[PDB]
Amino acid sequence: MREVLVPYAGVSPSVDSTAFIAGNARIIGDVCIGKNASIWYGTVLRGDVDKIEVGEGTNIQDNTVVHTGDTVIGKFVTIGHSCILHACTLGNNAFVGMGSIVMDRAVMEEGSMLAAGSLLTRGKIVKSGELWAGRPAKFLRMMTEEEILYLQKSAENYIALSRGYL
Amino acid sequence: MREVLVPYAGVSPSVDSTAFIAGNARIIGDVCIGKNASIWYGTVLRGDVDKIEVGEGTNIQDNTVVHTGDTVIGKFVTIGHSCILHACTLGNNAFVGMGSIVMDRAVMEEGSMLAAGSLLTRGKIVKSGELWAGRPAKFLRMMTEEEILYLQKSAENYIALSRGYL
Amino acid sequence: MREVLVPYAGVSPSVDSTAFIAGNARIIGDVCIGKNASIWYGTVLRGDVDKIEVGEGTNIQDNTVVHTGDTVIGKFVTIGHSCILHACTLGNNAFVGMGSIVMDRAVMEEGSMLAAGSLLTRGKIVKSGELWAGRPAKFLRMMTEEEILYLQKSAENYIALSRGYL
Numbered sequence A, B, C: 001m002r003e004v005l006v007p008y009a010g011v012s013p014s015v016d017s018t019a020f021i022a023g024n025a026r027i028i029g030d031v032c033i034g035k036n037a038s039i040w041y042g043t044v045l046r047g048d049v050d051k052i053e054v055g056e057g058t059n060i061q062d063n064t065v066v067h068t069g070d071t072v073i074g075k076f077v078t079i080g081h082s083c084i085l086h087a088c089t090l091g092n093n094a095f096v097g098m099g100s101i102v103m104d105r106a107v108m109e110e111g112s113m114l115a116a117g118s119l120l121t122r123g124k125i126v127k128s129g130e131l132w133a134g135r136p137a138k139f140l141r142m143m144t145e146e147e148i149l150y151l152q153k154s155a156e157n158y159i160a161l162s163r164g165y166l
């Protein structure tokens, strides 16, 4: 973790011992990583200018960049590969499809979803149970029962997956 | 390759000795890399949950993520920078434009192409000789003679390019 | 910098001593990096086939890939996270929004801007003072006074930010 955890302005990340951090991830400055979280290969959480909080049981998948107004990510959140997250707030069980961009001041409420490849623009609010999609992302429809159930299942799957590394 | 090749659940990648693997690439678990393939900087081939196969003479360019239903990539395939490939099948001489996302169960037939920045959604089939583009990607037109010739040329160029590293 | 700077065909990068280069960046071959530039985590500047020039005071943010017709990037340019730049020319004070793709032969004139998530296609010219957006990117509007001022401010902010690492 000597190469993985980087200080900025005297602040170093606080990482729960049960979190999985890929050896080539980079976590800089004011970043807190909760119990059973998993931060994947090539992910960059750059908390130099403002803070990043990552809740229990959250996965931030490969090559995602988080940087900024801080970034607050709740519990059991799934962030797909190669996302870009910028001073946003993601509620518990939020699901961000791979290849999505979430802009400054955007909010995903608890149990909401963004389709793969979405661009959620500044200040937009995805409400609980909603699926948004597109560029710029807009409300598409409510989620099905299967999709809602998958929010927690995805997070649990990733906790289990990450335990096969450590 | 000690840092580059990562075991998962007792399985480590099988890499042909003639393949180029960038020193900061990460290849995990059940992944097979063929003769003269080239896997570029910051690429992540994560074969933890299911297998990834990469055929002879294929290039997977920088910062691409492959992860999942397995991912089967044929021979002399070009995958551009910063793509995301998810349980898909790419036939020989398929060409995936940089910054594209290929979703679960999508298929590119032999000698087909996706434009840069495309989003090929679940289960869609790009037929041989076709060029698809957009988000969601849809049929645009057939490829020109020059474009069809370029499928093999791109792959050969990358084999030659990669030999200047090793 | 032993792992960061990579020779290709006998050519190694030329990096100003005042430039910040993240320890996991990869800079290959014919690449020149100017005074006070900053090249961020997971960025790949691959100057194997042709040259890459990066002017004074320019930031190229995390996980961006630059590769190709060469790539000429001027002074005090801001390139956002996870961009892909391909044989293009970016004038002084150009601003490329995060998650954008700039294709071969595209030009951004001095003091022009691309919105986040744009796809600037081959040979397109963004004129000074213009904001382009979309996929394919097209002229949206001229920039406001605040936006024009921000071009230089962004670059100065990044110089200052990078000095807290070195």
Ligand SMILES: [Mg+2]
Pocket: A067, A068, A086, C081
């Ligand atoms: Mg930023």
Ligand SMILES: [Mg+2]
Pocket: A081, B067, B068, B086
């Ligand atoms: Mg995946």
Ligand SMILES: [Mg+2]
Pocket: B081, C067, C068, C086
């Ligand atoms: Mg290229």
